[PDB]
């Protein structure tokens, strides 16, 4: 206060701010590839999906939408990429 | 006097002056 | 004999502080009036006003007198004291004392030529007291003081030669007008003009160089 670096803010002070109120605004959401262990291929599901994304071959479910982040449906395996 | 009882009295004045002026249209 | 207390009075009385630039520089609080009767002895006073204020009492009134007094010599210092007492002579005496305790300095400058011996204010300045706003504008040479008589006398004792004045609010109340103008002349040493941009090495207080000569027995 009265002297601080507003150009190089600390990462812990930046990981807590709103995604619009950081220094350069950027999304806190991500993508992740999911494989259901019945099939073999993987599909890329958004973290905040909003749709019932079913698998490509067996159309069952991978994520049911919610208020914020999507919920992966308890038989899954996901990697953030 | 209280301002709404002067307001009520004024409405009773205007209701009379509308009546006497209606007799001479 | 004076026999001072409040160590700055002893640095003044032993002669270790000679000018009020040493007090006005280090922002030292002045508690005794003889500190400026010795460091500013050619100071002249002026009683600006005497008015009766009154208090209602369970049988009658209590009328005491309120005196507005301005001191200040002719060379950049003024002070303004206001005091009620039960008697007018005691009120004027105590107003001279409070005006001597409150001596402020004045940054006077030029209208816009750098010629000899400054005559006017360096900046446009403004003081508010109560509702009275008194604004002082720098003026060309030979303007005189374009002001009301009490403001003109407060700026005359200041040593200001040329100034323009505007005022706003109930300027008939003499206390608030004189105090607004006193703020407007004390605020000339707060405006950071670009000739004061050069850094200074922050001198040591005179209370430490003459630490031995203070701190009485």
């Amino acid at each position: 206060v009265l002297v601080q670096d507003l150009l190089h803010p600390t990462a812990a002070s930046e990981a807590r701010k709103h995604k619009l109120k950081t220094l350069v605004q950027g999304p806190r959401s991500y993508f992740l590839d999911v494989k259901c262990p019945g099939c073999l291929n993987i599909t890329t599901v958004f973290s905040h999906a909003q749709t019932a994304v079913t698998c490509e071959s067996c159309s069952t479910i991978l994520c049911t939408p919610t208020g914020g982040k999507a919920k992966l449906s308890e038989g899954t395996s996901f990697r953030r990429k | 006097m209280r301002a709404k009882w002067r307001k009520k009295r004024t409405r009773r004045l205007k209701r009379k002056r509308r009546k006497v002026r209606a007799r001479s249209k | 004999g004076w026999v001072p207390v409040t160590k700055l009075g002893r640095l003044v009385k032993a002669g270790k502080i000679t000018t009020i630039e040493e007090i006005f520089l280090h922002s030292l609080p002045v508690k005794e009036f003889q500190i400026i009767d010795t460091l500013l002895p050619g100071l002249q006073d002026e009683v600006m006003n005497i008015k009766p204020v009154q208090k209602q009492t369970r049988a009658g009134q209590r009328t005491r007198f309120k005196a507005v007094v301005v001191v200040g010599d002719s060379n950049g210092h003024v002070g303004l004291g206001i005091k009620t007492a039960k008697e007018v002579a005691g009120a004027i005496r105590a107003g001279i004392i409070i005006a001597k305790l409150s001596v402020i300095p004045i940054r006077r400058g030029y209208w816009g030529t750098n010629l000899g011996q400054p005559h006017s204010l360096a900046t446009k300045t403004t003081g508010k007291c109560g509702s009275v706003t008194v604004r002082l504008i720098p003026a060309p040479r030979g303007s005189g003081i374009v002001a009301s008589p009490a403001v003109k006398k407060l700026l005359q004792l200041a040593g200001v030669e040329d100034v323009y004045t505007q005022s706003n609010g109930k300027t008939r109340t003499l206390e608030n007008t004189l105090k607004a103008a006193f703020v407007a002349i004390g605020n000339t040493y707060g405006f950071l003009t670009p000739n004061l941009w050069a850094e200074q090495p922050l001198p040591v207080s005179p209370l430490d160089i003459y630490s031995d000569e203070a701190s009485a027995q």
């Binding site: - | - | 922002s27 940054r107 000899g116 004061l196 850094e199 922050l202």
Partner: protein
């Protein structure tokens, strides 16, 4: 403040606050001047020799004088810790 022939007029060039570079007035009685002792080898600090700062009344009244003294003492070398620039 000078005049046509070189000469300084306007008595008392004022002091300035080390935390804000603002003019410390004559009627500023919350302003303060802090002398910090210079220390030689194995202590025993060098009497009559200080590093001095001045802080205005506004810096102290806002509660900023501690972080300002941390900053002003760190980048003189009195402290090699407390004040961190990225807040």
């Amino acid at each position: 403040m000078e005049n046509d022939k070189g000469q300084l007029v306007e008595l008392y060039v004022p002091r300035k606050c080390s935390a804000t570079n603002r003019i410390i007035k004559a009627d500023d009685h919350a302003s303060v001047q802090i002398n910090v002792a210079k220390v030689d080898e194995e202590g025993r600090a060098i009497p009559g020799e200080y590093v001095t700062y001045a802080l205005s009344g506004y810096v102290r009244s806002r509660g900023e004088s501690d972080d300002s003294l941390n900053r002003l003492a760190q980048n003189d070398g009195l402290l090699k810790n407390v004040w961190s620039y990225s807040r």
